[PDB]
């Protein structure tokens, strides 16, 4: 909506104040299509729009639109850090190394162009996605896979690389849980949702459930654990992890419902209900 | 391929076929010549294929290829059937130009296709080439007069 | 052998014209120690470069074959042998090479004083080694020396250009290094100003305004230099023009005003209103070009038309016959014209009247009938003037061609086709780019079915040796892009022609077929006329060994049909297999075999043994690892091209024969150079293809490590 204000500001200078917003709205706002007018009402010249010039090889077919931004990038970034860049030396490790995660990712959406089709191709990519898990696991998973997981298909590719990253969001503050689970409780697939179609993933449901003490709801949970001890506890691939987040919710859901109770007489029948929780 | 192949049998249930297969619309691989949906079909002529293609594939803008001529100069390259009434049933914007800057009138008059100012004046001097050559100067530059005399009719 | 039986075969002449036995037996004696100025243990070239090289100070040759080995001696001790620029190349190229140079035989000044040009080795110690020992030879050589020594002019002039590539590209390596840029230009410009070489004195003052403006200074230093531009521009008053031969002195000032100089805008107007006389005045062959080069960069529009009119007032009036060494002297690129070409460079077409290239358009259908008794067609400046433009539409620009089309056709001529293709491009009516291309010259024309076999259908006029009509006919068939023409009429007038028109003899034409036949064709989808015939055609590259060099030409069709391959190879397939044990026979060339088609081979999957015919050559190497010293020259390169193919073989480990070849490729990770590390990559492209290097984590990790 700023787009007309976001220009209504510019004019040379404020085109550097269209930067951090729309360089994140160019990919930011689902569509790459704001790069069209963006890449030429902002930089062809910065390292930022030289890396971003490449992506229209991805989004067409003509590799030159990636190309000299292997070699641009391989220089834009030995350059940026050469002098003191170490691994625990804090001012590395995380911008310069995200600006290098630019570089050894030229060869990587170019494999979902190069190798085709049925191949180790998913398992290699699985791999490109376990081998990405690396150098450790956190925060800014998104300036990165915001544009990287545009690797031919989004939670329908792997909702379990996410919403473990929406367990990073879950666990982070709800700007990082909510906005996510505003289009990741969309799944990307599945009415308010059906008590059978969200039978899609009890895990999206535990992305909705840990979320339903964020959403406060105890008695809909508790309804959903009641829908997980009557109707997946009747459902006796997804059916083996079930006991791993299902008695785990006859504790950690049953936990801060036992909160006025807790002693002597108040876990009595809530002894199991406790029984299964662990035994 | 395994989809841009039936673009070259333009067939339009072979295209209702590779629906169940649904590849991306305007071929998923656009060919690196920018032989897209019709930019491939219009570069090979096939309307029956430019009607089920606006239907499938009508997508966003489209593009340059990297030929610099979108498909509405590759349609003149195989004179695509009813592409005068199709680029009109699609908003094809009208400019649109080949590699000069000239709109493909000031391509098809350097042809002098009398046709390709026949569908052309049916669209409705004022197209100019890399160096400001009026349609009118790139038909006086080929002496291409069956277009210059259909550029007198248009003054 | 003791590169000294191949460095004595260049030392001394060992005929009337070596240098061809000096570029084979310093190009088969320097790319064989393989090493640099780091072989001293090169005193095995390099004393038989200091013995070369005295037998390069004594003879030099009287043809320059101890001079071109003199320049292939010291071009194999400046850059190849690497530690060169100040210890044994400023000692022994001023001890070769200045000792050879007081005298010069045949142009030692461009052989060994203009080698002392391209050493580029220290621009101040080349400014007291080569400018304080070259200003003693340029200075008792501006004048000759011992009149033999009568070539010290020669050795003026190509030495004075040449320490002015060392006031250029060493003292540009310092674009302020002051030669005395103003003062010794007065000498130089008075003491080869005579009638010596008057055309090589100039290039050292085309060096010292183009090395005084690199010294940009063009306002207080080419204005300290505007008298000695205003002694060179007076040198006509000053020396008349019959005293001290004023011709190429009147060709430096007028050549650096046109460049810069703060004087060309003040001299148009000054030394045009000198030489518009001096061109028209004696007619001189040096006073075409005292004029020529001033209006050529005076053109801007201020430099009046009193620039355009006099090279049209020498065109009309001093007879067109003025190309005058004499009144007829070979019908050619008239010498005004050889001024107004960089002048019409420099102006758009449809703006001058186009009657400034139609007074010339009658002197060239005049000229089209002129060289008919001479060359029998010159047209080379009609084409540099035809850049200009095309004008008019095709009002003139429909006729300024049917004429030139009849120019390069009737008697025996071609090579104008090498200039008539660039303007054939810029045209927005393609029109005669499509008309010249149905001439095709001899017999070969469109429309065909039976009777292609003659190719002795020749055009006469000035009759033929059919060898000049060899490379003067195949030069239409060499320029072409695979635009249009038929398979029957191009491929079968040319399956008729190209099979024989290659043999006899070499590749003259065949550099067009395999090129403009997979540029022209396939697809080509059922022509069973062109399946088992593109097979007939592919099986002239079995003996592409008609010459074992132009087999590089099938190595370039082998780094060429890498596309056309599979759908002319599933109805081969036993004569491929044969064309396969041909990659397996040859590529013989690039040490010994398999390489240029390495990846071209391994496409032929969904076929045969391809896995195994390549498995046996794999181990057959393994046991050559070479390093097994059993490779003495090339197997290292086959092992490793080997190997380089195995990278591209990308398929099977024959697990028990990938780890065991990897059980040498880590012994090989010891000794020699940049070889055995190409050798794990070339495996590791097909990683150990398990999902991990079983056990090679660590055995990579201490090789990594």
Swiss-Prot record, chain A:
Coiled coil: none annotated. It is found in: Cell membrane; Vacuole membrane. It comes from the Eukaryota. Belongs to the PI3/PI4-kinase family. The target of rapamycin complex 1 (TORC1) is composed of at least KOG1, LST8, TCO89 and either TOR1 (TORC1-A) or TOR2 (TORC1-B). TORC1 binds to and is inhibited by FKBP-rapamycin. Interacts with PIB2; following activation of PIB2 by glutamine. The target of rapamycin complex 2 (TORC2) is composed of at least AVO1, AVO2, BIT61, LST8, TOR2 and TSC11. TORC2 forms a homodimer. Contrary to TORC1, TORC2 does not bind to and is not sensitive to FKBP-rapamycin. Interacts with SLM1 and SLM2. Phosphatidylinositol 3-kinase homolog, component of both TORC1 and TORC2. TORC1 regulates multiple cellular processes to control cell growth in response to environmental signals. Nutrient limitation and environmental stress signals cause inactivation of TORC1. Active TORC1 positively controls ribosome biogenesis via control of rRNA, ribosomal protein and tRNA gene expression, and rRNA processing. This is Serine/threonine-protein kinase TOR2. The chain holds residues 1450 to 1750 of 2474 of the full protein.
Curated annotation (Swiss-Prot), chain B:
Present with 1180 molecules/cell in log phase SD medium. ANK repeats lie at residues 1-27, 33-63, 67-96, 100-125. Component of TORC2, which regulates cell cycle-dependent polarization of the actin-cytoskeleton and cell wall integrity. TORC2 controls polarity of the actin cytoskeleton, which is required for orienting the secretory pathway toward discrete growth sites, via the RHO1/PKC1/MAPK cell integrity pathway. It comes from the Eukaryota. The target of rapamycin complex 2 (TORC2) is composed of at least AVO1, AVO2, BIT61, LST8, TOR2 and TSC11. TORC2 forms a homodimer. Contrary to TORC1, TORC2 does not bind to and is not sensitive to FKBP-rapamycin. AVO2 is peripherally associated to AVO1 and TSC11. This is Target of rapamycin complex 2 subunit AVO2. It is found in: Cell membrane; Vacuole membrane. Signal peptide: none annotated.
